[PDB]
C-alpha cells in the first residue's frame, strides 16, 4: 500500500498524574454511589423513581438494579448536558430551549427563555445543506405537494416508486459503481443487509471501534466474529493468516467466506482508515471488504466522493460500499453500492426490501437536489466551494487547537475534532461552561469510552465562517485555561 | 539488615517453610507462560462418521501417459553379447557393460556348471543361519588378495552394496561431502542415513576446500560438538553420469589436512583402470591404505550378480553386523560366486586385456570426434561415455525423442545403442539426456570405425 | 470377516520365576561386561581387537564404544552358534565344516574334519526343492550353458531378455492376478518399490513385527508411519479411524493415501495374519493393502497358491502382492503382483527397474521349472504330494512337541515352530548341545526380541521323512530334560 499524500495522525498518551487523579475521582463516585444506594434501600431518603404497579408487585422484578448503577449515580448527575431540545434549523447557529431542574436533574421544567445564536458544533452537517431556504427546499416542497409525505407499502409490493429508481441510478453514477440501492435508515441498512451476505460458517473480521449498527448486523447473522485492533495492520494480517491456515474452530474445515467490516472515518476517534493496506491484504488473502462511508462520503475527497477518492483507489476494489445521507446531504436515509449481481441479489433477498416501508418522496427529492448540487449538474460554482471551505476550516481549527496546548486525536484531514478532558467532573464542567458562553458541544463519558479517555467532540462544517471559528476558539481557550485542560507536553 | 536476619533465625520453622513454598508458588506463576481458556470441545459421533464417509482416497498409481518411452522395453532374443539379436534384428552390442568379455568365456561357464552340480541354485537363508558356503569364503579371500587389502565382504545385489555400506558408518548429526554427479545408489545410501549432506561441484577441489573451511569455522564455534562429529568424503572412481575420472591425490591431501575419511565407489573402474586392473588407486599409484572403504560390484566387468566392499578389518568387520542388505537377506547363489572366482583367475592370469581395452577406448574416442549435432562427454580412458546434444531444445521430451530416433536409425543399421535412463523426479542433479556408448575388448577396430561412421551419418541426417 | 475354518493359535505367557531368573542372568552379564570394559580401558588386559592405524589417531573415533557393548560382552561369548559354514546342498541333511576357537570365540580356526549328515532345521526349503540332482537342475544347466551366468545391463536398457517376460507371465498365472514383475532381490523388492507407490503426505500403517525390508522401504519414502499391535484388529481399526478423522498432524488435511503393510506368515513369531479382518477393514475404510508373502507363497494353501488360497479369499482384494522365490522355490529372486496399471507404473517408475541389474538367466529357469512342477503342468503327481507331506509334517511335529510340555508360539498350521528358552545361557547351551547331537537349529537372543523371549526356530520341510522327525523329536526331548526347558503349565 502506497500513500500518494502524507498520512499523519497523532494519539498522545495520557499524563500519568492525570490518570491517577481520574481513578481517584471514579473511586469517590463509586463509594458515594454505594452509600446513596444504601440510603435509598432503607427508605431513609425519598426515592425519585417510578415503581411497578400494585397489581404486579408479585411479578419478578422487571430490571436488575445493579445494571442501572452508573445511570443513577454518574449519568444522572450530569444529565443536563444531553438531550437538549433545539427549536430551529440545525445550521451554524441553533436555538436551544432553556430547561432547569430543582431536584438535581431528575426532572426538567422548561423555562420560557429561549437561547438564541448558539454556535453549533454537535450537528452532523458537513457541507451546510441543512438550510431553511434554498433550491433543495423548493424542490422538496414541490415533490411533497404532488406526491405526499410517506408511502404506505413495501418496495416489492406496490410501494415501489419511480423517484426511488431515479435516486438509485443517481447514486450509482455518483459513487462510480455499477449499481446501488437505497434504504430508509442507515442503521436499517447495516442491520438488514449484513445478515444477507454472510451466514453460518463464514468469518467476520470486525474493527475495534465499529458502530453499533455493524455489530448488531454481524450478531444477527450466524457468522463467527473476530475483532482486530484499531488500525493495526499487523493484527489484521495475523488474524487473516490464522483464519486461513487453521480453518473453522472445532472441526478444522475451511471457511466459506471472510468479510472485513471497516469504516471510512471513525466518529469518536477521528482517525481515517488505512485503505490501501486493507485493499492490499484483501487482494493477498482473498477476502471481501465492507466499507462504511457514513461520515466520509461528503466530507472527504477533493470532489467529495468519499475515502476512495481521497486516497485515490479504484472504487471497484471494495466489494460493498455502505453509506448514509444523514450526515452530509441533510436527509435521512442510507444506501449500498456495488456490482450489479450484488444489487440484484440484495433486491431479491433483503429484509428491508421485503418487510419495511421505503423512503419518503420529499426526502429522496432533497437528496437528489443536494447530490446534483455537489456533482455540478446545477451549473453553479457551489459544491466545490463547500468542499474547499470545509477543508480550510478543518485545517485552521486543528492547527489553532493544537498550538494552544490541547490534546487532539485523529487524522489531520478529518473534520471531527475530539478534544480530551480525561476527568469525570470536567465533563459536566466543560459542557456547562461551553453552553454558558453560547457554544454547543458533545461530551462522552465512561460506559462509552475507555476509563482514562473522556472526550468532547467538535463537528466542523462549511457553514462556519472565520469569525465563528475565531469566537469559538477564544471561548475554548478561556475555558481550557479555567479547567486546566491543556495537558499537551509539546505545546502549551 | 543484621536485625532482619536475627529475627528470621528466631522465627519458627513452619513459618519459614510456608514462606518458602509461597515463594516457589510465586516463581511457578511468574513462569506460567501458557495461557489457558478452559474451553474444551469434543466432536460428535455423527460428525466423525460424516468425516469418515466423506473422505475419498487418491488412486494408488497416477494415470500414466501412453507416450512414455521407458514403457517400451527392448526384447533381446538370446544372451546379451557381441552379435546379439535385439527386437528381432541382428546387431553388434555397443550398449551392455561387459568390458572384459567374460560373459561368454567357456571357462566361466564350466566353473559355474561344476558348482551348480555340487551345490544347486539356491542358498536358502541369510549368512547367519546356514547360508554361508565355502565358496563365499573363497571368493572373499580371492577379492582380498586381488585388491591388496586385508578383508572384503560380498553382497548379493549391486545396489545394496553401497546403499547399505554408507548408512552403516554415517549416523545422524555427521557431515558428508559428496560429489554432485553421483549415481542413484550413493544418493539412496545417503538418504538412508540421516547425516547432513554437503554437495560440491563436480571435480572441483576449490569447492571442497571452501566447504571444509566453512566446517572448520563452525567447529571453532563449538569444540565440544566438533569432538563427536565425523566427516566423510564420498566419491566415485570413474563417474557413471559424466564419464570422467576423479583427482585422488588432491582428495587424499585434503583428507590428511582436514581429518575426513574417504569412501570410494569403483563400480566402473574396478576392472578397466590400472596396469593390473585394481581400480583408480593403481592408475594414480596412490597407496591402497589411504582410502578407508572401497566399494564395487561384480556385475559390469566380472559378469555375475553381486557386489563387494573391501578395506581393513577395522572398517569391514562392522558391516557384517550392521549392513541391512547383509544381515537381512539371502546369500549369493554358489554358481554366481564360482563364476566370479573363475573370472578373477582369468583376470589375474593375463593382464594385457586391460591394455587392449585402453587402446580400443582410445581408438573409438578419437574416431567419434567431429559430430556436428552431438558432443562427446567423457575421457579417453573411460570405457563408457556419453553423446549429448550440442544444441539443446527448450524441453527435455523433444531431446529424448531426437535421441531415440537416432538410436532406432542406428539399430536398423546393425549397431545396438541404448540411451541413458533416469528417474526424472527423484534425481538430485539430473544429467542431460545422452546416448550411452560402451566399448568392449570383443569389438575389433574395424567394427569401431564402422560404428563411428554409422552414428556420424545418422546424426548428420537426423539433426539436419 | 468370516473364517471358513477354525483359527487356532496359542501364545502362552512366561512363568513368573523364569522371568525373575532371566533378569538375574542379564544383570550378571551386564555387571561383568562393565568390569571387562574397565579392565580393557586401562590396558591391564590385552584386547584382541583391531585398532585404527597410527596415521589416523588424530581423526575422530569412527565408532562409539557403547553401541558395541552387547557385541563384545554377550554376542562374542556365544558367537559359535551363528555363521556356520556348510559344504553341501541344504537338504534334509547338510554337511557342516567344523571349527574350534582357543581365544574364547574371538578368533576361529577350521579343523580338517567335516560333520556329515546333520539334520537341517535351519534352512528355508519348505517344499524341498533344494536338490542338486533333479529336472530343475538339468533345465538350469541347459540354460546356463547357452545364456551364460549373469546379465550385464538394466531392464530398461538392453539388459531385458525373453526369459524375464516368460517368468513374469508364469508368475501372473500362478498368483491369479492380471500382471506381475520380477526383481533380483527380495530385499530390493520392498526397499525400491515401496517408495514409488507412496510418497510424502501419505500414511503407512505398519505391523509391529514387519521384516527389516518393509521398515526400510517405509523409512526411505517420506510418508508418515504408525505401528499397530501384532494381529490386534482393534488397534488397526482404531488407528484407521483416528487417521481418517483427525487428518494430518501439523495441518489437519485429509491423507492422500493410506497403505497397510502386512505379512503372510511372520517368521520368528510363527503366526498367520488375520486376512479376512484386514480385508474387511480395508474395504470399509478405503485403504490399500500390501501383502508380503515371502513365507506363505509355497508353504501355505492346498496347492501352495499362497495365504489367500488358505483363507479362501479373492486375490483381487489385495492391492499389492509381494513375494520371494528364495524360501519355497529354491532360487533367489522376488516379485510383485497386481493389476496391469500397477505393473505398468512400476515398470516405468521403479528404482530397481531403472538402476539395477535384472535376474540371472539360470535362476529364472530354475524358478520356471519349480513353479511349473507346483502348478502340475509337468503332469507328474510330484509337486502335489509335497504340500500334503509338509502339512502332515507340521501337524505331527507341532502336536508331539506340544505334548512333551514345551512352550510353542504361533498358529497350528504354520511350518515355522518357535520353541522358547527364556534365558541367555540356555541359548548357547541349546545350540551347542543340539549340534553335539547332530541337529542344526537357529537360536535368537535379546536385542532381536523382547528381553524375556529368547527362542529357537525350527523350519520344517517336505523333504523330512518320518524317521528324521522321530530322531529329532527324541533328541529334543532329551535336551529338554537336560536343560529343563519344559515351562508349560497345561501339559508336561
Ligand atoms: C454489594 C455491596 C458492596 C459493598 C461495598 C461497599 C463499599 C463502599 C463502602 O465501604 O463505604 C460506603 C458504604 O457502603 C455500603 O454501605 C454498601 C451497602 C450496600 C447495600 C446494598 C443493599 C442491596 C440489597 C460509604 O462510603 P462513604 O463513607 O460515603 O465514603
Ligand atoms: C558411567 C559408568 C557406569 C559404571 C557403573 C559401574 C557398575 C558396575 C559395578 O559397580 O561393578 C563393576 C565395576 O565397574 C567398574 O569399575 C567400571 C567403571 C566404569 C567403566 C567404564 C569403561 C564390577 O562388578 P563385579 O564385582 O565384577 O560384579
Coordinates of N, CA, C and O in Angstrom, one line a residue, chain B residues 55-122:
Chain B
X55 N -14.4 -38.8 3.2 CA -13.1 -38.9 2.7 C -13.0 -39.9 1.6 O -13.5 -41.0 1.7
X56 N -12.3 -39.5 0.5 CA -12.1 -40.3 -0.6 C -10.6 -40.4 -1.0 O -9.9 -39.3 -1.1
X57 N -10.0 -41.5 -1.0 CA -8.5 -41.6 -1.2 C -8.1 -41.5 -2.7 O -8.9 -41.8 -3.6
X58 N -6.9 -41.0 -2.9 CA -6.3 -40.9 -4.2 C -6.0 -42.3 -4.7 O -5.8 -43.2 -4.0
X59 N -6.1 -42.5 -6.0 CA -5.7 -43.8 -6.6 C -4.3 -44.1 -6.3 O -3.4 -43.3 -6.1
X60 N -4.0 -45.5 -6.2 CA -2.7 -45.9 -5.8 C -1.6 -45.5 -6.8 O -0.5 -45.1 -6.4
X61 N -1.9 -45.6 -8.1 CA -1.0 -45.3 -9.1 C -1.6 -44.1 -10.0 O -2.8 -44.3 -10.4
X62 N -0.9 -43.0 -10.2 CA -1.5 -42.0 -11.0 C -1.6 -42.5 -12.5 O -0.8 -43.4 -12.9
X63 N -2.6 -42.0 -13.2 CA -2.7 -42.4 -14.6 C -1.5 -42.1 -15.4 O -1.0 -40.9 -15.4
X64 N -1.0 -43.0 -16.1 CA 0.3 -42.9 -16.9 C 0.0 -42.6 -18.3 O -0.9 -43.2 -18.9
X65 N 0.7 -41.6 -18.9 CA 0.6 -41.4 -20.4 C 1.1 -42.6 -21.1 O 2.0 -43.3 -20.7
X66 N 0.4 -42.8 -22.3 CA 0.9 -43.9 -23.2 C 2.1 -43.5 -24.1 O 2.5 -44.3 -24.9
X67 N 2.5 -42.3 -24.0 CA 3.6 -41.8 -24.8 C 5.0 -41.9 -24.1 O 6.0 -41.4 -24.6
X68 N 5.1 -42.5 -22.9 CA 6.3 -42.6 -22.1 C 7.3 -43.6 -22.9 O 6.9 -44.7 -23.1
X69 N 8.5 -43.1 -23.2 CA 9.4 -44.0 -23.9 C 9.8 -45.2 -23.1 O 10.0 -46.3 -23.7
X70 N 10.0 -45.1 -21.8 CA 10.5 -46.2 -21.0 C 9.5 -47.3 -20.9 O 9.9 -48.4 -20.5
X71 N 8.3 -47.1 -21.3 CA 7.3 -48.1 -21.3 C 7.6 -49.2 -22.3 O 7.2 -50.4 -22.1
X72 N 8.3 -48.9 -23.4 CA 8.6 -49.8 -24.4 C 10.0 -50.4 -24.0 O 11.0 -49.7 -24.0
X73 N 10.0 -51.7 -23.7 CA 11.2 -52.4 -23.3 C 11.8 -53.1 -24.5 O 11.1 -53.7 -25.4
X74 N 13.2 -53.1 -24.7 CA 13.8 -53.8 -25.7 C 13.9 -55.3 -25.4 O 14.3 -55.7 -24.3
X75 N 13.4 -56.2 -26.3 CA 13.4 -57.6 -26.0 C 14.5 -58.3 -26.8 O 14.5 -58.3 -28.0
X76 N 15.4 -58.8 -26.0 CA 16.6 -59.5 -26.6 C 16.3 -61.0 -26.7 O 16.0 -61.6 -25.7
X77 N 16.4 -61.5 -27.9 CA 16.1 -62.9 -28.2 C 17.4 -63.7 -28.2 O 17.8 -64.3 -29.2
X78 N 17.9 -63.8 -27.0 CA 19.2 -64.5 -26.8 C 20.0 -63.9 -25.7 O 19.6 -62.9 -25.1
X79 N 21.2 -64.5 -25.5 CA 22.1 -63.9 -24.5 C 22.6 -62.5 -24.9 O 22.8 -62.3 -26.1
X80 N 22.7 -61.6 -24.0 CA 23.2 -60.2 -24.4 C 24.7 -60.3 -24.6 O 25.5 -60.4 -23.6
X81 N 25.2 -60.3 -25.8 CA 26.6 -60.5 -26.1 C 26.9 -59.8 -27.5 O 26.0 -59.3 -28.1
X82 N 28.2 -59.9 -27.9 CA 28.6 -59.4 -29.2 C 27.8 -60.2 -30.3 O 27.6 -61.4 -30.2
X83 N 27.3 -59.5 -31.3 CA 26.4 -60.0 -32.3 C 25.1 -60.6 -31.7 O 24.8 -61.7 -31.9
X84 N 24.5 -59.7 -30.9 CA 23.2 -60.1 -30.3 C 22.1 -60.0 -31.3 O 22.3 -59.7 -32.5
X85 N 20.9 -60.2 -30.8 CA 19.6 -60.0 -31.5 C 18.6 -59.2 -30.7 O 18.0 -59.7 -29.8
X86 N 18.5 -57.9 -31.0 CA 17.6 -57.0 -30.3 C 16.4 -56.7 -31.2 O 16.6 -56.3 -32.3
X87 N 15.2 -56.9 -30.6 CA 14.0 -56.7 -31.3 C 13.8 -57.4 -32.6 O 13.2 -57.0 -33.6
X88 N 14.4 -58.6 -32.6 CA 14.4 -59.5 -33.8 C 15.3 -59.0 -34.9 O 15.2 -59.6 -36.0
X89 N 16.2 -58.1 -34.7 CA 17.2 -57.6 -35.7 C 18.6 -57.9 -35.1 O 18.9 -57.6 -34.0
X90 N 19.4 -58.5 -36.0 CA 20.8 -58.8 -35.6 C 21.6 -57.5 -35.5 O 21.5 -56.6 -36.4
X91 N 22.3 -57.3 -34.4 CA 23.1 -56.1 -34.2 C 24.4 -56.4 -33.4 O 24.5 -57.5 -32.8
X92 N 25.3 -55.5 -33.5 CA 26.5 -55.5 -32.7 C 26.3 -54.8 -31.4 O 25.8 -53.6 -31.4
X93 N 26.7 -55.4 -30.3 CA 26.4 -54.9 -29.0 C 27.3 -53.7 -28.6 O 28.5 -53.9 -28.4
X94 N 26.8 -52.5 -28.5 CA 27.5 -51.3 -28.1 C 26.8 -50.7 -26.9 O 26.9 -49.5 -26.7
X95 N 26.1 -51.5 -26.1 CA 25.2 -50.9 -25.0 C 25.3 -51.6 -23.7 O 24.8 -51.1 -22.7
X96 N 26.0 -52.8 -23.6 CA 25.9 -53.6 -22.4 C 27.3 -53.5 -21.7 O 28.3 -53.6 -22.3
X97 N 27.3 -53.2 -20.4 CA 28.5 -53.1 -19.6 C 29.2 -54.5 -19.4 O 29.1 -55.1 -18.3
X98 N 29.8 -54.9 -20.5 CA 30.6 -56.1 -20.4 C 32.0 -55.8 -21.0 O 32.2 -56.0 -22.2
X99 N 32.9 -55.2 -20.2 CA 34.1 -54.7 -20.8 C 35.0 -55.8 -21.2 O 35.5 -55.9 -22.4
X100 N 35.4 -56.7 -20.3 CA 36.4 -57.7 -20.5 C 35.9 -58.9 -21.3 O 36.7 -59.7 -21.8
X101 N 34.6 -58.9 -21.6 CA 34.0 -60.0 -22.4 C 34.1 -61.4 -21.8 O 34.4 -62.4 -22.4
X102 N 33.9 -61.4 -20.4 CA 33.9 -62.7 -19.7 C 32.6 -63.3 -19.6 O 32.5 -64.4 -18.9
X103 N 31.5 -62.8 -20.1 CA 30.2 -63.4 -20.0 C 30.1 -64.7 -20.8 O 29.5 -65.7 -20.3
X104 N 30.8 -64.8 -21.9 CA 30.7 -66.0 -22.8 C 32.0 -66.8 -22.7 O 32.2 -67.7 -23.5
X105 N 32.9 -66.5 -21.8 CA 34.1 -67.3 -21.7 C 33.8 -68.7 -21.2 O 33.2 -68.9 -20.2
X106 N 34.2 -69.7 -22.0 CA 33.8 -71.1 -21.7 C 34.3 -71.6 -20.3 O 33.7 -72.4 -19.7
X107 N 35.4 -71.0 -19.8 CA 35.9 -71.4 -18.5 C 35.0 -71.0 -17.4 O 34.7 -71.8 -16.5
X108 N 34.4 -69.8 -17.5 CA 33.4 -69.3 -16.6 C 32.2 -70.2 -16.5 O 31.7 -70.6 -15.5
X109 N 31.7 -70.6 -17.7 CA 30.5 -71.5 -17.8 C 30.8 -72.8 -17.2 O 30.0 -73.4 -16.5
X110 N 32.0 -73.4 -17.5 CA 32.4 -74.7 -16.9 C 32.5 -74.6 -15.4 O 32.0 -75.5 -14.7
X111 N 33.1 -73.6 -14.8 CA 33.1 -73.5 -13.4 C 31.8 -73.3 -12.8 O 31.4 -73.9 -11.8
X112 N 30.9 -72.5 -13.4 CA 29.6 -72.3 -12.9 C 28.8 -73.6 -12.9 O 28.0 -73.9 -12.0
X113 N 29.0 -74.4 -14.0 CA 28.3 -75.7 -14.1 C 28.7 -76.7 -13.1 O 27.9 -77.4 -12.5
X114 N 30.0 -76.7 -12.8 CA 30.6 -77.6 -11.8 C 30.0 -77.2 -10.4 O 29.5 -78.1 -9.6
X115 N 30.0 -75.9 -10.1 CA 29.4 -75.5 -8.8 C 27.9 -75.7 -8.7 O 27.4 -75.9 -7.6
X116 N 27.2 -75.6 -9.9 CA 25.8 -75.9 -9.9 C 25.5 -77.3 -9.6 O 24.6 -77.7 -8.9
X117 N 26.3 -78.2 -10.2 CA 26.1 -79.7 -9.9 C 26.5 -79.9 -8.4 O 25.8 -80.8 -7.8
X118 N 27.5 -79.3 -7.8 CA 27.9 -79.5 -6.5 C 26.9 -79.0 -5.5 O 26.5 -79.7 -4.5
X119 N 26.4 -77.8 -5.6 CA 25.6 -77.1 -4.6 C 24.1 -76.9 -5.0 O 23.3 -76.9 -4.1
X120 N 23.8 -76.6 -6.2 CA 22.5 -76.2 -6.6 C 22.4 -74.8 -6.9 O 23.4 -74.1 -7.1
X121 N 21.1 -74.3 -6.9 CA 20.9 -72.9 -7.3 C 20.7 -72.0 -6.1 O 21.3 -70.9 -6.1
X122 N 20.0 -72.4 -5.1 CA 19.6 -71.6 -4.0 C 20.4 -71.8 -2.8 O 20.9 -73.0 -2.5

